[PDB]
Symmetry: D2
Subunit: 221 residues, 4 copies
């Protein structure tokens, strides 16, 4: 198998894109560490991966708590000694209305998960990737830094912010042979498996190859 | 005078771009409400504005505290009944090293000022601008959403995030005749007065005119 | 006023944005050299400039030919010896269908005007601006380089192309005190000709030290 | 392997990226139609493809002429009846000086190859792809649309132009199951030809449902 002997951490793995990425990496032989808030929705996906012949485990982790993320990483690295693929996929939305109508607590909840947690996760897993001189950090971004979403202002800030965050970290980590990439829409409707296929393509590149960004347009009809 | 009878709030007004924007708007007749952390550096600038014949006042405000920002806005609107120009200029930097080396508390301090405070300020002053169907919110962004800064990853995230935030809020507010604009570098070295001149140009547009973004390249030699 | 004794070239100056930019520049005291395919469409705008007490001449310039652009600039320089303000405003459209149905002759007509003419104009006037150590070249772009127009593929290319062409020339000419700028829309989704004319006014009359390189404009407030 | 019984056109296929893309596509079982100004520079690459047991033909195509591109595509279609993979890879450079010193003939040579040829090629092969309800058009772009090259102004225009041209054509052709894509650099600041060839391989062999529209590549890990 392409990813046999590897460990893959997928956030927001309970449904949709996250679930599909989990199954895909599991089918290639990676041991998939699934995380989300709801353990029960995770277990369905854990069972499917195992049923089809792969390895998977489930961990509740509240991504808005820094200590919780450090506890989660410490457990994963203590149990398996490595993380080959970190997929930043967990995301929240807020589309209630204009930015002045957004409460600070709603701002905090959205930025904590969409922007701060991918930084915390990279901070928790990158030092191990550096020491091993290998690994992928792959970020699912639902906006390409181009068009604002009226009534989704904080949301937009978090995605363009993620893009700038991870584009910068890519220049920092490449000297240690660690690869940070971005997956984003190339239009403006995408089947989860297509994004899963892109992540699989990223995680199985030749050693020297460094694809930094893939833009995907809606599945054909 | 072009801005006579108007109130202009300028954040980070104690030195450089902020100071220069303060003096410029003061010279056009605006009453300038200066804010920063250090009251003493503010007073020098307050004295210059008054010395040259304008009106100005100084207020310490810690932009990383939401309540402090609401207290500050409440005072300004209670004292003058209006805010015609809000300039988001206060900014912090962090260029210590790669993103995994950045401490969460340093992340928090940078994002609180560069990204959350401009949202809090818009939230505190926009409702008054909406009710009056007029006003400018002008954001000084030191990056145009284009090039990452290695070793300034959080910093980059905060500027691209600001851009997406304010581009979205511009679509929301325009229906109430309130105008959100962005000033940013167009290259890659800029004299503070040139940025001050751009802000003055934004604050004095024809009613109907909506310049949303100005890119500025280094002062000529 | 501000631009007294300057000459401003303005292409596609017979209506809309070009017309307004013409009127706005003349009203600030610049002599407005106007351009269009046909000299008769220009008379109306030339009249409004004079009537308000500014100077204005009219030339037929076919922007699809180099020779034509060369002869046109030669004349302007022989007559006045300077060009202070070159406004690349003329453009064509093509939205007939998908790219593969577009014929080479249509491609050529669109690219010649939208992408090649602004270069030729810059080439013909930049020497005088460089020698004089001052000048503005201002470009009106209907696309900001972000979103594609389906069934306007060549049109899209010509605009993103223009943005790249003039962003680069701007770096080349800074050293000579010549300022190249762009004006483009600020949203994907409606803009009053005067809003643009005002922005152009603003660029044409900046402080010498300052260099505004791009201005994005959103639809006029209603 | 993956591409058995397909035909892949590859322009500028005599060395570097084009050479590698050629080898990589042949090794997956596609018949590789190679292009260059001169048919002799192609023999080496054609030999490597056959030697490894793939098929490959060589044509001299002068991309600066429409007729030439038309005659070239006509031949390929008469000979095989399909083009599965069109790789727009050939390009020229010009970095002689600032835009105003660039002569119209040099402008024309650069634009004809960099911007007009990819359109002409797409126009000549898209009809067959549309009829067949499958096909890839893959474009190699050396600029991502963000940063200007001072003293490479026309070059810059041709690349940002290409990005806009092909982003638009991609929207036009989705409905017919034809997939247009871009490959470009991921940093302002050095990339192994095989990295590109691999990405092209990846695009050429996607699932039918999927549509990757752009791939950015950073310099090869050292
Ligand atoms: O807004 P929305 O309706 O788009 O929310 P949402 O759909 O429930 O969030 C989508 C994905 O991100 C994960 N996620 C959301 N918040 C999280 C948190 N605080 N910690 C960890 N994972 C989280 C979710 O896992 P969970 O739904 O199990 O939290 C889910 O798998
Ligand atoms: O990083 P750095 O070295 O770039 O910092 P910095 O230079 O001191 O920040 C630049 C400007 O932003 C303001 N600012 C910084 N932090 C602030 C805060 N918490 N609340 C309000 N205003 C603030 C500063 O006013 P003050 O320097 O008076 O805080 C200063 O005028």
């Amino acid at each position: 198998s392409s990813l046999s002997g590897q460990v893959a951490v997928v956030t927001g793995a309970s449904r949709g894109i996250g679930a599909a990425i989990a199954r895909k990496l599991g089918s290639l032989g990676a041991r998939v560490v699934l995380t989300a808030r709801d353990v029960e929705k995770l277990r369905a996906v854990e069972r499917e991966i195992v049923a089809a012949g792969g390895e998977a485990e489930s961990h509740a982790c509240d991504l808005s708590h820094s200590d919780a993320i450090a506890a989660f990483a410490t457990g994963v690295l203590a149990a398996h000694g490595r993380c080959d693929v970190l997929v930043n996929n967990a995301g929240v939305g807020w589309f209630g209305g204009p930015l002045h109508t957004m409460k600070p607590a709603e701002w905090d909840a959205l930025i904590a998960v969409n922007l701060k947690a991918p930084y915390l996760l990279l901070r928790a897993f990158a030092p191990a990737m550096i020491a091993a001189k290998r690994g992928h950090i792959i970020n699912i971004s639902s906006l390409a830094g181009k068009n604002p979403v009226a009534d989704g202002a904080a949301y937009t800030a978090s995605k363009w912010g993620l893009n700038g965050l991870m584009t910068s970290a890519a220049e920092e980590l490449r000297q240690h042979q660690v690869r940070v990439s971005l997956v984003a829409p190339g239009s403006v409707a995408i089947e989860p498996d297509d994004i899963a296929d892109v992540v699989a393509l990223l995680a199985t590149q030749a050693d020297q190859s460094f694809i930094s960004e893939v833009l995907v347009r809606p599945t054909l009809k």
